[PDB]
């Protein structure tokens with residue numbers, strides 16, 4: 175049974191790795207705002223929105239008990255973006271860049287956590 179400070183120390187470097195991907199992480203730093211973006215169908219398509227600010231806040235305040243719940247949220251944000259956006263769009267290709275980065279950093283940390 176993990177403690178939320180153990181979880182934060184080990185997983186937060188993987189989250190900071192995402193934030194550094196400038197400009198790729200910019201669309202993902204805050205919730206998608208469908209009104210601002212003019213995309214009224216977004217919450218029809220994305221039933222469980224997620225973004226970097228929400229994951230950071232959940233990490234910071236201890237809302238994850240096990241590491242796979244953090245991993246699930248990160249992949250939720252990618253899958254939402256791959257689902258809603260066309261393959262030709264910048265955010266789609268941005269999402270693939272951050273997903274590539276993420277797999278690269280999450281593997282060793284998950285194996286030392288377990």
Ligand SMILES: Cc1noc(C)c1-c1ccc2c(c1)nc([C@@H]1CCCC(=O)N1c1cccc(C(C)(C)C)c1)n2[C@H]1CC[C@@H](NC(=O)OC(C)(C)C)CC1
Nearest residue numbers: 197198200201202204206207211213254255258259264265
């Ligand atoms: C993910 C995802 N999944 O589906 C969807 C849908 C998203 C998603 C999400 C956001 C998005 C977005 C797509 N396209 C944009 C803008 C909007 C115009 C069109 C465009 O080409 N863009 C764009 C895309 C890729 C890269 C960038 C940079 C690198 C220039 C920044 C821009 N943005 C925000 C819109 C406003 C955000 N600023 C903000 O919220 O400011 C406050 C003060 C916090 C409210 C920052 C980028």
